[PDB]
Amino acid sequence: ATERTLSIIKPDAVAKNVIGEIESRFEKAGLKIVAAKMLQLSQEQAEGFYAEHKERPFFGDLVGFMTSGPVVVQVLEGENAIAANRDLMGATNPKEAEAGTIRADYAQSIDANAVHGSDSPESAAREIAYFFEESEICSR
Amino acid sequence: ATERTLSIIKPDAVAKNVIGEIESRFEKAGLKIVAAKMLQLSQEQAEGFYAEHKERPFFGDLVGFMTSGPVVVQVLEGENAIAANRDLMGATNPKEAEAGTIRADYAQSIDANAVHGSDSPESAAREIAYFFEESEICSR
């Protein structure tokens, strides 16, 4: 089933100016970016998005980094988009990621991994809704 | 002098899913996308942006096409950004564009050229202002 998932090119990947390179991995894999916008997350914005880790000791670092610079939040749409995305991204922890994946090629650490992708249909739906209004998403 | 210029990945380039490929041309050339958002231009939006051609016989086709699908409007920032951008884009008319340029590689015609770039400092300033608020632009 064709589905929608949220993807975020993180502060570290944009600073390296590899936005195009990452986009191409998704597009070459048959997924389409149907919504996208570059922005600088506010303390409040990042905290509400990672609310689930609100009380975990890594919270500050998660939010801290993820606010260290501008990012590109977007929506990828395609066949098996959510899982397909997870396959291109690689393991969350760059050091345990298979070669060829985005994290293995562009990430420096857990905090500084290069991208973010929803892990499931349920989270994809709330993650997308959190950053975008239906009008901002243009399927095609 | 480092400057800012407006760039638009057009309906034809996005439909071909070469967004990443185009972005990479700018990033490899040392320019940074400091603002960006994907959207579907409204009749009214495209008309006000190309107001200057409001009474030209190609207006309808210009607007028509440029509204045929979603686009990515953005801001490129860097050394000699405006002219540098014009150099990577190639001649407005794809058929007279030097090989290696964006238009020579991705464009099908005058209407359907793959990108748009401001032609001068004065137009860059009004073009950027038309699509973005200062807050949306994140220099770095």
Side-chain angles (χ1 to χ4, degrees):
Chain A
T2 91
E3 55 200 11
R4 286 184 177 166
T5 180
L6 189 96
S7 166
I8 303 176
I9 304 188
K10 296 195 171 171
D12 64 323
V14 322
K16 286 179 184 293
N17 304 107
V18 287
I19 290 179
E21 270 163 74
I22 289 179
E23 296 299 45
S24 289
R25 298 283 191 94
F26 305 136
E27 295 181 314
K28 216 97 77 181
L31 301 171
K32 333 228 188 97
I33 102 135
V34 301
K37 61 183 171 202
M38 175 173 277
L39 84 189
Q40 169 79 71
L41 291 170
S42 59
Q43 177 104 307
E44 196 175 84
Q45 255 170 311
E47 276 176 13
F49 184 66
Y50 290 112
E52 194 184 314
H53 318 289
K54 165 183 169 59
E55 290 178 298
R56 290 187 170 104
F58 60 79
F59 195 58
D61 294 305
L62 184 48
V63 165
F65 162 74
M66 208 59 180
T67 213
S68 61
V71 314
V72 179
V73 295
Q74 57 187 184
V75 177
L76 299 179
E77 182 173 278
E79 176 64 32
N80 193 48
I82 302 178
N85 190 205
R86 286 170 79 50
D87 297 329
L88 297 170
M89 288 193 296
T92 295
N93 190 307
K95 247 190 283 177
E96 65 179 51
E98 293 174 48
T101 62
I102 302 169
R103 273 147 188 178
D105 293 327
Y106 297 101
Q108 302 275 178
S109 57
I110 301 173
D111 287 342
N113 42 25
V115 287
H116 156 88
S118 301
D119 70 10
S120 68
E122 17 295 310
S123 61
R126 91 134 209 290
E127 272 171 29
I128 289 178
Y130 181 89
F131 280 123
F132 296 97
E133 291 307 305
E134 271 301 314
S135 61
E136 292 172 274
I137 308 162
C138 321
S139 279
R140 81 199 144 71
Chain B
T2 91
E3 55 200 11
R4 286 184 177 166
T5 180
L6 189 96
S7 166
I8 303 176
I9 304 188
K10 296 195 171 171
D12 64 323
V14 322
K16 286 179 184 293
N17 304 107
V18 287
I19 290 179
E21 270 163 74
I22 289 179
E23 296 299 45
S24 289
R25 298 283 191 94
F26 305 136
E27 295 181 314
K28 216 97 77 181
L31 301 171
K32 333 228 188 97
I33 102 135
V34 301
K37 61 183 171 202
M38 175 173 277
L39 84 189
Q40 169 79 71
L41 291 170
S42 59
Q43 177 104 307
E44 196 175 84
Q45 255 170 311
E47 276 176 13
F49 184 66
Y50 290 112
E52 194 184 314
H53 318 289
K54 165 183 169 59
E55 290 178 298
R56 290 187 170 104
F58 60 79
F59 195 58
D61 294 305
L62 184 48
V63 165
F65 162 74
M66 208 59 180
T67 213
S68 61
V71 314
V72 179
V73 295
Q74 57 187 184
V75 177
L76 299 179
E77 182 173 278
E79 176 64 32
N80 193 48
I82 302 178
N85 190 205
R86 286 170 79 50
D87 297 329
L88 297 170
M89 288 193 296
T92 295
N93 190 307
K95 247 190 283 177
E96 65 179 51
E98 293 174 48
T101 62
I102 302 169
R103 273 147 188 178
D105 293 327
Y106 297 101
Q108 302 275 178
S109 57
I110 301 173
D111 287 342
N113 42 25
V115 287
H116 156 88
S118 301
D119 70 10
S120 68
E122 17 295 310
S123 61
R126 91 134 209 290
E127 272 171 29
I128 289 178
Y130 181 89
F131 280 123
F132 296 97
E133 291 307 305
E134 271 301 314
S135 61
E136 292 172 274
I137 308 162
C138 321
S139 279
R140 81 199 144 71

Short mmCIF file of all heavy atoms in Angstrom, two decimals, chain A residues 7-66:
data_model
loop_
_atom_site.label_atom_id
_atom_site.label_comp_id
_atom_site.label_asym_id
_atom_site.label_seq_id
_atom_site.Cartn_x
_atom_site.Cartn_y
_atom_site.Cartn_z
N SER A 7 9.92 12.58 7.37
CA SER A 7 11.37 12.52 7.26
C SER A 7 11.88 13.91 7.64
O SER A 7 11.25 14.93 7.33
CB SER A 7 11.78 12.18 5.83
OG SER A 7 13.15 12.43 5.61
N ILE A 8 13.00 13.93 8.36
CA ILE A 8 13.63 15.19 8.76
C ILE A 8 15.10 15.11 8.40
O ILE A 8 15.78 14.16 8.77
CB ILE A 8 13.54 15.43 10.30
CG1 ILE A 8 12.07 15.41 10.76
CG2 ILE A 8 14.15 16.81 10.64
CD1 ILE A 8 11.92 15.54 12.27
N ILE A 9 15.58 16.07 7.62
CA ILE A 9 16.99 16.12 7.31
C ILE A 9 17.43 16.97 8.51
O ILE A 9 16.93 18.07 8.71
CB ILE A 9 17.24 16.81 5.94
CG1 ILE A 9 16.44 16.07 4.86
CG2 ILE A 9 18.74 16.78 5.59
CD1 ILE A 9 16.73 16.51 3.41
N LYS A 10 18.32 16.42 9.33
CA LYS A 10 18.77 17.06 10.57
C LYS A 10 19.83 18.15 10.43
O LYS A 10 20.50 18.25 9.41
CB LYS A 10 19.26 15.95 11.53
CG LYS A 10 18.15 14.99 11.96
CD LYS A 10 18.52 14.13 13.17
CE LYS A 10 17.29 13.37 13.67
NZ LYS A 10 17.57 12.34 14.71
N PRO A 11 20.00 18.98 11.49
CA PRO A 11 20.96 20.08 11.53
C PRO A 11 22.35 19.77 11.02
O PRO A 11 23.00 20.63 10.40
CB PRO A 11 20.98 20.47 13.00
CG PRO A 11 19.62 20.14 13.45
CD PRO A 11 19.40 18.79 12.82
N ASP A 12 22.82 18.55 11.29
CA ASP A 12 24.14 18.10 10.88
C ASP A 12 24.19 17.85 9.39
O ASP A 12 25.18 18.17 8.74
CB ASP A 12 24.52 16.82 11.63
CG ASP A 12 23.61 15.67 11.30
OD1 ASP A 12 22.40 15.92 11.11
OD2 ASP A 12 24.09 14.52 11.22
N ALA A 13 23.13 17.29 8.83
CA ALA A 13 23.18 17.03 7.40
C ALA A 13 23.05 18.33 6.61
O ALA A 13 23.74 18.48 5.62
CB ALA A 13 22.12 16.04 6.99
N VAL A 14 22.20 19.26 7.05
CA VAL A 14 22.08 20.52 6.31
C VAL A 14 23.37 21.35 6.36
O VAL A 14 23.78 21.93 5.34
CB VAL A 14 20.90 21.42 6.80
CG1 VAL A 14 19.70 20.56 7.16
CG2 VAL A 14 21.33 22.27 7.95
N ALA A 15 24.01 21.39 7.54
CA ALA A 15 25.26 22.14 7.71
C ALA A 15 26.32 21.62 6.77
O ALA A 15 27.18 22.37 6.32
CB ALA A 15 25.76 22.05 9.16
N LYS A 16 26.25 20.32 6.46
CA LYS A 16 27.20 19.71 5.53
C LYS A 16 26.74 19.96 4.10
O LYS A 16 27.44 19.61 3.18
CB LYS A 16 27.29 18.20 5.74
CG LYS A 16 28.05 17.74 6.95
CD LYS A 16 28.03 16.20 7.02
CE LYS A 16 28.70 15.68 8.30
NZ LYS A 16 30.18 15.94 8.32
N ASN A 17 25.56 20.54 3.92
CA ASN A 17 25.05 20.84 2.58
C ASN A 17 24.92 19.62 1.70
O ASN A 17 25.32 19.65 0.55
CB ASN A 17 25.91 21.90 1.87
CG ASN A 17 26.05 23.17 2.68
OD1 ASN A 17 27.10 23.47 3.25
ND2 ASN A 17 24.97 23.91 2.78
N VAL A 18 24.34 18.57 2.25
CA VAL A 18 24.13 17.34 1.51
C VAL A 18 22.64 17.10 1.37
O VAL A 18 22.20 15.97 1.17
CB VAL A 18 24.81 16.13 2.23
CG1 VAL A 18 26.33 16.21 2.07
CG2 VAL A 18 24.46 16.14 3.71
N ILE A 19 21.87 18.17 1.47
CA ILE A 19 20.41 18.09 1.33
C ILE A 19 20.04 17.37 0.02
O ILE A 19 19.23 16.43 0.01
CB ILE A 19 19.74 19.51 1.36
CG1 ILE A 19 19.83 20.10 2.77
CG2 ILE A 19 18.27 19.42 0.88
CD1 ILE A 19 19.24 21.52 2.92
N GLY A 20 20.64 17.78 -1.09
CA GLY A 20 20.33 17.16 -2.36
C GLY A 20 20.68 15.69 -2.41
O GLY A 20 19.92 14.88 -2.96
N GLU A 21 21.82 15.33 -1.84
CA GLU A 21 22.26 13.94 -1.82
C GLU A 21 21.30 13.05 -1.07
O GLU A 21 21.03 11.93 -1.49
CB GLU A 21 23.65 13.84 -1.22
CG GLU A 21 24.71 13.97 -2.28
CD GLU A 21 26.08 14.28 -1.72
OE1 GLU A 21 26.71 13.36 -1.14
OE2 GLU A 21 26.52 15.45 -1.86
N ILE A 22 20.78 13.54 0.04
CA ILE A 22 19.84 12.75 0.79
C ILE A 22 18.53 12.63 0.04
O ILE A 22 18.00 11.53 -0.11
CB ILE A 22 19.65 13.35 2.18
CG1 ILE A 22 20.93 13.11 2.98
CG2 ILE A 22 18.42 12.78 2.83
CD1 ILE A 22 20.96 13.65 4.36
N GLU A 23 18.03 13.75 -0.47
CA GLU A 23 16.79 13.74 -1.24
C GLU A 23 16.84 12.72 -2.35
O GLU A 23 15.88 12.00 -2.56
CB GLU A 23 16.51 15.11 -1.84
CG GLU A 23 16.28 16.21 -0.83
CD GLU A 23 15.08 15.95 0.09
OE1 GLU A 23 14.90 14.81 0.61
OE2 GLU A 23 14.30 16.91 0.30
N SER A 24 17.96 12.67 -3.06
CA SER A 24 18.12 11.74 -4.16
C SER A 24 18.01 10.27 -3.76
O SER A 24 17.61 9.44 -4.56
CB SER A 24 19.47 11.97 -4.86
OG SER A 24 19.47 13.17 -5.58
N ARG A 25 18.38 9.94 -2.53
CA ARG A 25 18.29 8.56 -2.05
C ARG A 25 16.83 8.14 -1.99
O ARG A 25 16.48 7.01 -2.33
CB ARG A 25 18.90 8.42 -0.66
CG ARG A 25 20.40 8.76 -0.56
CD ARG A 25 21.27 7.64 -1.09
NE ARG A 25 22.69 7.84 -0.77
CZ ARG A 25 23.29 7.33 0.30
NH1 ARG A 25 22.59 6.58 1.15
NH2 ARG A 25 24.58 7.56 0.51
N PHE A 26 15.96 9.05 -1.56
CA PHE A 26 14.54 8.77 -1.46
C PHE A 26 13.89 8.71 -2.83
O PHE A 26 13.08 7.82 -3.13
CB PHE A 26 13.84 9.84 -0.62
CG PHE A 26 14.43 10.05 0.75
CD1 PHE A 26 14.64 11.34 1.24
CD2 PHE A 26 14.73 8.96 1.57
CE1 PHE A 26 15.14 11.55 2.53
CE2 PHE A 26 15.22 9.14 2.86
CZ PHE A 26 15.43 10.44 3.34
N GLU A 27 14.25 9.67 -3.68
CA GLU A 27 13.68 9.77 -5.02
C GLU A 27 14.11 8.66 -5.94
O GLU A 27 13.35 8.21 -6.81
CB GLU A 27 14.05 11.11 -5.65
CG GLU A 27 13.48 12.33 -4.95
CD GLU A 27 13.89 13.60 -5.65
OE1 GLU A 27 15.10 13.69 -5.98
OE2 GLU A 27 13.04 14.50 -5.89
N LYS A 28 15.35 8.22 -5.77
CA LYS A 28 15.88 7.14 -6.58
C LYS A 28 15.19 5.85 -6.15
O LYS A 28 14.97 4.96 -6.97
CB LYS A 28 17.38 7.02 -6.38
CG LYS A 28 18.14 6.63 -7.63
CD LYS A 28 18.72 7.85 -8.31
CE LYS A 28 19.95 8.36 -7.59
NZ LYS A 28 20.51 9.58 -8.25
N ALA A 29 14.86 5.75 -4.87
CA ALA A 29 14.21 4.58 -4.30
C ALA A 29 12.72 4.55 -4.62
O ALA A 29 12.00 3.68 -4.13
CB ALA A 29 14.41 4.54 -2.80
N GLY A 30 12.26 5.50 -5.44
CA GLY A 30 10.86 5.54 -5.80
C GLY A 30 9.92 6.26 -4.83
O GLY A 30 8.71 6.13 -4.95
N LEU A 31 10.45 7.00 -3.87
CA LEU A 31 9.55 7.71 -2.96
C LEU A 31 9.50 9.16 -3.41
O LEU A 31 10.46 9.67 -4.01
CB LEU A 31 10.04 7.61 -1.51
CG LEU A 31 10.17 6.20 -0.92
CD1 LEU A 31 10.87 6.28 0.41
CD2 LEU A 31 8.80 5.56 -0.79
N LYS A 32 8.39 9.84 -3.13
CA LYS A 32 8.27 11.24 -3.56
C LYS A 32 8.13 12.18 -2.39
O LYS A 32 7.42 11.88 -1.45
CB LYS A 32 7.05 11.43 -4.47
CG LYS A 32 6.63 10.20 -5.23
CD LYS A 32 6.40 10.52 -6.69
CE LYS A 32 5.78 9.33 -7.45
NZ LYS A 32 4.29 9.46 -7.55
N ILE A 33 8.84 13.31 -2.41
CA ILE A 33 8.65 14.24 -1.31
C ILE A 33 7.40 15.04 -1.74
O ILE A 33 7.40 15.73 -2.77
CB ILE A 33 9.88 15.16 -1.06
CG1 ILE A 33 9.63 16.52 -1.62
CG2 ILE A 33 11.19 14.54 -1.61
CD1 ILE A 33 10.05 17.61 -0.65
N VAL A 34 6.33 14.89 -0.96
CA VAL A 34 5.05 15.54 -1.23
C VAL A 34 4.74 16.74 -0.35
O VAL A 34 3.69 17.36 -0.49
CB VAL A 34 3.90 14.51 -1.13
CG1 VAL A 34 4.12 13.36 -2.14
CG2 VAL A 34 3.83 13.93 0.29
N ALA A 35 5.68 17.08 0.52
CA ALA A 35 5.54 18.20 1.45
C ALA A 35 6.92 18.44 2.03
O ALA A 35 7.64 17.50 2.36
CB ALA A 35 4.57 17.83 2.58
N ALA A 36 7.29 19.70 2.18
CA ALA A 36 8.62 19.98 2.70
C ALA A 36 8.79 21.45 3.07
O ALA A 36 8.25 22.31 2.39
CB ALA A 36 9.69 19.57 1.65
N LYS A 37 9.54 21.72 4.13
CA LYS A 37 9.85 23.09 4.54
C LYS A 37 11.05 23.15 5.48
O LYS A 37 11.15 22.36 6.42
CB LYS A 37 8.64 23.76 5.20
CG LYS A 37 8.17 23.07 6.46
CD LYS A 37 6.94 23.77 6.96
CE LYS A 37 6.31 23.01 8.09
NZ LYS A 37 4.87 23.40 8.18
N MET A 38 11.98 24.07 5.19
CA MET A 38 13.17 24.27 6.01
C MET A 38 12.87 25.20 7.17
O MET A 38 12.25 26.25 6.98
CB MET A 38 14.31 24.89 5.20
CG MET A 38 15.55 25.23 6.04
SD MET A 38 16.98 25.78 5.02
CE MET A 38 17.69 24.20 4.53
N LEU A 39 13.30 24.83 8.37
CA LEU A 39 13.07 25.70 9.51
C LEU A 39 13.99 25.42 10.68
O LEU A 39 14.71 24.42 10.71
CB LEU A 39 11.62 25.65 9.97
CG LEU A 39 11.09 24.58 10.91
CD1 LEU A 39 9.60 24.75 10.92
CD2 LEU A 39 11.45 23.17 10.46
N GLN A 40 13.96 26.35 11.62
CA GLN A 40 14.76 26.27 12.83
C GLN A 40 13.78 25.97 13.93
O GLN A 40 12.94 26.81 14.27
CB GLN A 40 15.44 27.61 13.11
CG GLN A 40 16.07 27.70 14.46
CD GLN A 40 17.40 27.02 14.55
OE1 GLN A 40 18.40 27.48 13.98
NE2 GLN A 40 17.44 25.90 15.24
N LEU A 41 13.88 24.76 14.48
CA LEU A 41 12.98 24.33 15.55
C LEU A 41 13.18 25.14 16.80
O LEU A 41 14.31 25.47 17.16
CB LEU A 41 13.19 22.85 15.86
CG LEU A 41 12.75 21.86 14.80
CD1 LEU A 41 13.27 20.49 15.18
CD2 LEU A 41 11.24 21.85 14.65
N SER A 42 12.09 25.49 17.46
CA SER A 42 12.20 26.25 18.69
C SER A 42 12.31 25.23 19.82
O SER A 42 11.93 24.06 19.64
CB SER A 42 10.96 27.15 18.90
OG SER A 42 9.74 26.40 18.94
N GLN A 43 12.84 25.65 20.96
CA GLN A 43 12.98 24.78 22.12
C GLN A 43 11.66 24.06 22.30
O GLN A 43 11.59 22.84 22.38
CB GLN A 43 13.28 25.63 23.35
CG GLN A 43 13.36 24.85 24.64
CD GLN A 43 14.80 24.66 25.09
OE1 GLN A 43 15.64 24.18 24.32
NE2 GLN A 43 15.08 25.04 26.33
N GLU A 44 10.59 24.85 22.33
CA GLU A 44 9.24 24.35 22.53
C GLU A 44 8.79 23.36 21.46
O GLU A 44 8.12 22.37 21.77
CB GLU A 44 8.27 25.53 22.58
CG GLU A 44 6.89 25.22 23.14
CD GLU A 44 6.02 26.46 23.28
OE1 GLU A 44 5.38 26.86 22.27
OE2 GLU A 44 5.98 27.05 24.40
N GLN A 45 9.15 23.63 20.21
CA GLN A 45 8.76 22.76 19.09
C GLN A 45 9.40 21.38 19.14
O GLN A 45 8.75 20.36 18.91
CB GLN A 45 9.11 23.42 17.77
CG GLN A 45 7.94 23.99 17.03
CD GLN A 45 8.38 24.83 15.85
OE1 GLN A 45 9.25 25.70 15.99
NE2 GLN A 45 7.78 24.60 14.69
N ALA A 46 10.71 21.36 19.39
CA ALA A 46 11.45 20.11 19.47
C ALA A 46 10.98 19.30 20.67
O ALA A 46 10.84 18.09 20.59
CB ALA A 46 12.93 20.40 19.57
N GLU A 47 10.72 19.98 21.79
CA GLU A 47 10.27 19.31 23.01
C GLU A 47 8.92 18.64 22.88
O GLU A 47 8.68 17.60 23.49
CB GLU A 47 10.20 20.29 24.17
CG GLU A 47 11.52 20.51 24.86
CD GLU A 47 11.43 21.56 25.94
OE1 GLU A 47 10.31 21.95 26.31
OE2 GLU A 47 12.51 21.99 26.42
N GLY A 48 8.04 19.25 22.11
CA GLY A 48 6.71 18.69 21.94
C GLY A 48 6.70 17.55 20.96
O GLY A 48 5.82 16.70 21.01
N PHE A 49 7.68 17.54 20.06
CA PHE A 49 7.79 16.49 19.06
C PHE A 49 8.40 15.24 19.67
O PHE A 49 8.07 14.14 19.29
CB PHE A 49 8.66 16.95 17.90
CG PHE A 49 8.73 15.94 16.78
CD1 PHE A 49 7.61 15.62 16.03
CD2 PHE A 49 9.91 15.31 16.48
CE1 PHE A 49 7.67 14.68 14.98
CE2 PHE A 49 9.98 14.37 15.44
CZ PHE A 49 8.85 14.07 14.70
N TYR A 50 9.33 15.44 20.61
CA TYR A 50 10.00 14.33 21.29
C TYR A 50 9.41 14.25 22.70
O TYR A 50 10.11 13.89 23.65
CB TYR A 50 11.51 14.60 21.41
CG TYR A 50 12.29 14.55 20.11
CD1 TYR A 50 12.86 15.70 19.57
CD2 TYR A 50 12.42 13.34 19.39
CE1 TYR A 50 13.54 15.67 18.35
CE2 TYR A 50 13.09 13.29 18.17
CZ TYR A 50 13.64 14.45 17.65
OH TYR A 50 14.26 14.42 16.42
N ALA A 51 8.13 14.58 22.85
CA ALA A 51 7.50 14.56 24.17
C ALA A 51 7.68 13.23 24.87
O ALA A 51 7.93 13.18 26.06
CB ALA A 51 6.02 14.88 24.05
N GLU A 52 7.58 12.15 24.11
CA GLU A 52 7.70 10.83 24.68
C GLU A 52 8.97 10.56 25.51
O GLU A 52 8.95 9.70 26.38
CB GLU A 52 7.60 9.81 23.57
CG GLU A 52 7.39 8.44 24.07
CD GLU A 52 7.39 7.42 22.97
OE1 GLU A 52 6.71 7.68 21.94
OE2 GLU A 52 8.05 6.36 23.15
N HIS A 53 10.05 11.30 25.24
CA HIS A 53 11.34 11.16 25.93
C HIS A 53 11.55 12.30 26.93
O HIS A 53 12.63 12.46 27.52
CB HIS A 53 12.45 11.17 24.87
CG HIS A 53 12.10 10.36 23.67
ND1 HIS A 53 12.05 8.98 23.68
CD2 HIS A 53 11.69 10.73 22.43
CE1 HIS A 53 11.61 8.54 22.52
NE2 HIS A 53 11.38 9.58 21.74
N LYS A 54 10.50 13.08 27.10
CA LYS A 54 10.41 14.22 28.00
C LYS A 54 11.12 14.04 29.35
O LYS A 54 11.67 15.00 29.88
CB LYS A 54 8.92 14.51 28.24
CG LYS A 54 8.56 15.41 29.39
CD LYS A 54 7.04 15.53 29.52
CE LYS A 54 6.64 16.21 30.84
NZ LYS A 54 7.20 17.59 31.01
N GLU A 55 11.09 12.82 29.88
CA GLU A 55 11.70 12.55 31.17
C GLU A 55 12.92 11.65 31.11
O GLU A 55 13.42 11.19 32.15
CB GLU A 55 10.68 11.94 32.13
CG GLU A 55 9.61 12.91 32.58
CD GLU A 55 8.60 12.25 33.47
OE1 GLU A 55 7.91 11.31 33.01
OE2 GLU A 55 8.48 12.67 34.65
N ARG A 56 13.41 11.39 29.91
CA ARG A 56 14.59 10.56 29.79
C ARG A 56 15.83 11.44 29.90
O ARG A 56 15.83 12.60 29.50
CB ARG A 56 14.54 9.80 28.45
CG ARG A 56 13.45 8.72 28.44
CD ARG A 56 13.52 7.88 27.19
NE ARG A 56 12.66 6.70 27.22
CZ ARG A 56 11.51 6.59 26.56
NH1 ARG A 56 11.06 7.59 25.83
NH2 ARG A 56 10.80 5.47 26.64
N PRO A 57 16.90 10.92 30.49
CA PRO A 57 18.13 11.68 30.66
C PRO A 57 18.83 12.15 29.38
O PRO A 57 19.74 12.98 29.42
CB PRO A 57 19.00 10.75 31.51
CG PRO A 57 18.60 9.42 31.03
CD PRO A 57 17.09 9.53 30.93
N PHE A 58 18.43 11.62 28.23
CA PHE A 58 19.06 12.05 26.98
C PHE A 58 18.22 13.15 26.32
O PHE A 58 18.66 13.75 25.35
CB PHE A 58 19.28 10.86 26.02
CG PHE A 58 18.03 10.15 25.61
CD1 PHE A 58 17.19 10.68 24.62
CD2 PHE A 58 17.68 8.94 26.20
CE1 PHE A 58 16.02 10.01 24.22
CE2 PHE A 58 16.52 8.27 25.82
CZ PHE A 58 15.69 8.80 24.82
N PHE A 59 17.04 13.43 26.89
CA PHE A 59 16.15 14.45 26.36
C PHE A 59 16.84 15.77 25.98
O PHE A 59 16.78 16.19 24.82
CB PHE A 59 15.00 14.74 27.34
CG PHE A 59 13.87 15.50 26.72
CD1 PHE A 59 13.19 14.98 25.61
CD2 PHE A 59 13.46 16.74 27.24
CE1 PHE A 59 12.13 15.68 25.03
CE2 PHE A 59 12.39 17.45 26.66
CZ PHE A 59 11.73 16.92 25.55
N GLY A 60 17.48 16.42 26.95
CA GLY A 60 18.20 17.66 26.70
C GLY A 60 19.13 17.60 25.49
O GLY A 60 19.12 18.50 24.65
N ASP A 61 19.95 16.56 25.40
CA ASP A 61 20.85 16.42 24.27
C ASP A 61 20.06 16.21 22.97
O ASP A 61 20.44 16.75 21.93
CB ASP A 61 21.80 15.24 24.49
CG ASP A 61 22.77 15.45 25.65
OD1 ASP A 61 23.48 16.48 25.66
OD2 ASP A 61 22.84 14.58 26.55
N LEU A 62 18.98 15.43 23.01
CA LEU A 62 18.16 15.16 21.83
C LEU A 62 17.65 16.48 21.28
O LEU A 62 17.88 16.82 20.13
CB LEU A 62 16.97 14.27 22.20
CG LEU A 62 16.05 13.79 21.08
CD1 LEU A 62 16.91 13.24 19.94
CD2 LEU A 62 15.10 12.72 21.62
N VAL A 63 16.94 17.20 22.14
CA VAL A 63 16.40 18.51 21.86
C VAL A 63 17.53 19.51 21.55
O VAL A 63 17.49 20.20 20.54
CB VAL A 63 15.58 19.00 23.07
CG1 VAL A 63 15.30 20.47 22.96
CG2 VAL A 63 14.28 18.21 23.16
N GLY A 64 18.53 19.56 22.42
CA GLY A 64 19.64 20.49 22.22
C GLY A 64 20.20 20.49 20.81
O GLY A 64 20.26 21.52 20.14
N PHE A 65 20.59 19.32 20.36
CA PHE A 65 21.16 19.15 19.04
C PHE A 65 20.16 19.46 17.95
O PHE A 65 20.44 20.14 16.96
CB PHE A 65 21.57 17.70 18.86
CG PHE A 65 21.76 17.32 17.43
CD1 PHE A 65 22.89 17.77 16.72
CD2 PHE A 65 20.77 16.61 16.75
CE1 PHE A 65 23.03 17.53 15.38
CE2 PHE A 65 20.91 16.37 15.41
CZ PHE A 65 22.04 16.84 14.71
N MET A 66 18.99 18.88 18.12
CA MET A 66 17.92 18.99 17.14
C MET A 66 17.38 20.40 16.98
O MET A 66 16.42 20.65 16.24
CB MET A 66 16.83 18.02 17.54
CG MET A 66 16.01 17.49 16.43
SD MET A 66 17.07 16.63 15.22
CE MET A 66 15.69 16.24 14.23
#
